[model samples]
Target chain A: SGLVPRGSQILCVGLVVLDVISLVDKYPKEDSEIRCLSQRWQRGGNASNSCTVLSLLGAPCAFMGSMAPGHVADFLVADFRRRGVDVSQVAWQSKGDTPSSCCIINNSNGNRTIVLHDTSLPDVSATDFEKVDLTQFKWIHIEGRNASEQVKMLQRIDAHNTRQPPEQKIRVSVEVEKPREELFQLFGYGDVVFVSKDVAKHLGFQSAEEALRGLYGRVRKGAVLVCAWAEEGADALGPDGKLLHSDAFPPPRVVDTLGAGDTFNASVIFSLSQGRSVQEALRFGCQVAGKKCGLQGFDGIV
Target chain B: PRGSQILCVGLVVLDVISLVDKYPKEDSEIRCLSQRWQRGGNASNSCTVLSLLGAPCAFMGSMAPGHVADFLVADFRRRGVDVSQVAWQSKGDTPSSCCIINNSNGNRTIVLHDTSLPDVSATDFEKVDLTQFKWIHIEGRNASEQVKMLQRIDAHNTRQPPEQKIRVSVEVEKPREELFQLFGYGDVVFVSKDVAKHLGFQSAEEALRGLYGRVRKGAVLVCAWAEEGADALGPDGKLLHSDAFPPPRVVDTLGAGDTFNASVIFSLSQGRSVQEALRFGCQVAGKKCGLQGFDGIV
Candidate 1:
């Protein structure tokens, strides 16, 4: 009954935060002075930005995360609601300050230095995952935080798949941008895996093609592995042992580079679920990410 | 009835301050110990101290509409400084200053960017009600524009009765060549050690005497020397000096001059004698230097 077809809905799991951005000509040296040209505030975070892009692409996505009760949380909730992201599964607690990031963006080249403050809100546990009606969403996207706790969530989803018929089984994708000891156990749980160049390089891979090929063999029997390289395009290795490539679309003016990777991941997930080829999905993802670079925040994605 | 208020006119700036342990070697990177964002300018700082000292003060300056401008305006409003007369410009240029303060010895290096906002001119002065204010403090940035403003106020005072007249005070520290001409319009003149030395005077007493002879009749000239205290000379030929009260520890030396100028204006406007006013200014300025910011003296 909502925007997306009934069987095409997805669930996004991770952080939602407020970002304070200051635009400066250049960073200052020690005991030196430099002035900022402008400043602004916007909604940000990995999963929050991705879900906003997915919802704008006509996919009804629900955000499953924790939000502390405060004015900052209130702003985040309102922003999510305005962007058409469903927040019925959000865990609202009575205490703790909402998470925020202070970003110093250089106007010369759009490079940003970020300082993040995490909140004390409870992470999503297995009990929280059991409450969701798995049959409603066709895909589930997970962010790599609270690694052990997310493992419990994946186990519950795995158990759900055993009871459902083959056609009704839910597919899962995980975004792993950082390296962690506990995250090595998470690779086999998701049918699709999306990773950044940093994560691939950490795992001893030379190129996106090599990372995709290496990850494609370690994941479940029928899985897809995609690796995104900034300005170097993206590559995907499907279950059929075919590697596909898509060149990056450079924007005329790069205003912000905060959420380009998240936008790419979300676009890839949405385009693939619609039965598009791996090459087509990579092309579509690069287009959305390139255009997002020209704007300030994800609001323009809608 | 509206109480007597002080009108301060000059720049309104946003200051980005970073505190570090030491000055790094050339081109080497180091992390800041702490950082702060504050509202700071000569007139803005003076008016803030004056308001916190239980005096009514208003700010009249130019600023654009943006987050930086919004923050500066809110800071003034929160400190009980009147901001209704601030000129709003449609352009996006907002003046700002960046200061790197060394935590080891309390030294500061500053860089400033001046916006294109129009200066307060004679027309701006003509629009304000001169009868409501007992004193006006001005900063010496644009000498030509300030002279026009002083002439307008001088003509208005000449038309008023003696008790209802307004007093004009000026703070000059730059453009040293114009020091003599700028002194002619001030009822009270404040000078720093750098400005005084640039004018070929070695001691505060010499600077005060040279400045006193150049001002209009009934004018007062005061010169502040950082470690040697302050000296004053009035039209009555009375010379007074206040011994410097060196703070037990100097935490910050950024806003000492602005604090000294505002204290003199506040004390003299309260009808304190010339000697008492000089002592009060020195005491307040010393107290301000002991603290990290200008807000402590209040």
Candidate 2:
């Protein structure tokens, strides 16, 4: 049973931008103007997306991040609140712009071509996270974008964890999704680390199990490292040098793969919090994420 | 001449506009030259250009309640167009036009996402203070509602003194039978080149003169052709034409027609003659073709 505690609030931190998706029959050539079949706006970001999955999966969750002030922020906030994710901790600053990601999806083939606009929204620092009460959160999952500031944030979390009892201590998980030199600093901070396939390949590993064992001693004691290989399933390394593998639970049809990885990470976090074994959680996560890829958005995903 | 205000009635939709150097092939990813958001829809665009041309303009339309709606309202306010008369729907995504512009030729292709967003009906138009506006510009869309609103405008005109009577102008761009019927209700009817040519007239001169009989008594008929300039047939029964004014380069052609309509409305509202207004409209529209947006053009 992937049963999370009734009041257990998982905190996810990252950027939430507006995604404008345009569906077209075919991508137009350069110097040509073509019509799109349809279009829509959806709230987008790694951590925010996980909150969407986490909420739908019956995991109590809250989102913390920084955003500019405007209707765009209002749009993002309303979507978060509507998805049952608490957004009261969002840092609403007076300046900057809402970052946007424009996606052109081909109808004949399910392929998304995205163009990301740079965000001018202020980065959430340790000072902002310092305001968050550690006692209220059971687990904290964060994206690995602001590594410089996140190091300070993790140190503060460590300071909070040191003063708490075992039951009161908040567990931490970091998503090493993007391959960047700066994020290398945040590697040893998570009690659970979600390693991306891209990052695994960047570390010169071909398979999930190799990437897991490759970073065994480098991880902290009693920590778990999880990696999701695209079609080959997932692999995990437990704190005691035990290895686990879950087969790729392929869906009947894979419609959208945009947030499949995030869905897997959130599902694993939920299962682990429910006191399930690492092997069970790994298998459960692959199952959930595979189901997620068969539909658009996270609705009915649970 | 001092005019009260120009009220443009039509759809006010959000446009997700992107500029690309070249189009891409199927199932391929490419970078955009630039992309941005702006308020679109013919009548709303006219309101912007009207305000830019120093006319006190207001927009009356239907809008869904969303951040995109908020964006449209904020833009109108920033551009000095009154939105007090906008009819707000309780819920739904705002109507959005996915616009792709080829920067090389400055041609645009639009895909409109407007299923649930409601249209501005006659009930909404009934709430407007018709006396405050010297000119009422109607986009020939939402057929039955346009007819109803035009009838209301016709009724409102009878109750006002001749000095306060509103001069109505209708833009019949798209070829539709119901829209063509809008001619009888308009004091000035602005016809698109496509519509004029569709009416089986060879040129702007032939189009305006040939279609002059369809208008109200003492009404003016105007036709704007892309390169042939525009022609006006006033109540005087004289066909007057303005030579086309091409800018140094036509970087953008989008909204150039709305610019012409707005400029003509401004000049005519200021007591300029039909021939002079036609020249002014072409000149202003020509200047607008050189710029991306309606700025620094008179």
What DockQ do you compute for every candidate structure?
Answer: 0.14, 0.25
Task: Looking at model 1 chain A, report the run of 10 residues with the lowest lDDT sum.
Answer: A27-36
Q: Give lDDT tens digits, candidate 1, residues B1-298.
A: 1339998888888765655677544324455565556688889988888988899999888888876777888899888999987877777576866566677766665555666677777676678776778898888877887888889888888888878788899888764566457788778988777788877899998888776777788888889998798998887887899987668876566667777888889998999987888888889888877777766575
Worst window of 10 by summed lDDT in candidate 1 chain B = B23-32
What is each predicted model's overall lDDT from 0 to 1? 0.78, 0.82
Q: What does candidate 2's lDDT look like per residue over A57-150, in tens digits? A: 8988988888877666788988998998888778877776666666778888877766564555678988888887666689899889889999
Which candidate's DockQ is highest? 2
Please state the CAPRI-style docking class of candidate 1: incorrect
For candidate 2, give the lDDT of residue A192.
91
TM-score for each model: 0.70, 0.80
**Per-residue error at A21 for model 1, in Å?**
6.4
lDDT of 2 by residue, B190-221 (tens): 98887877789889988888888889999999
What lDDT does model 2 reach? 0.82
Instruction: Output the number of the lDDT-best candidate.
Output: 2
Candidate 1 regions exceeding 4 Å error are A1-172, A178-191, A213-223, A238-244, A249-258, A290-302, B1-3, B13-42, B63-77, B88-121, B140-143, B160-164, B171-184, B188-261, B271-298
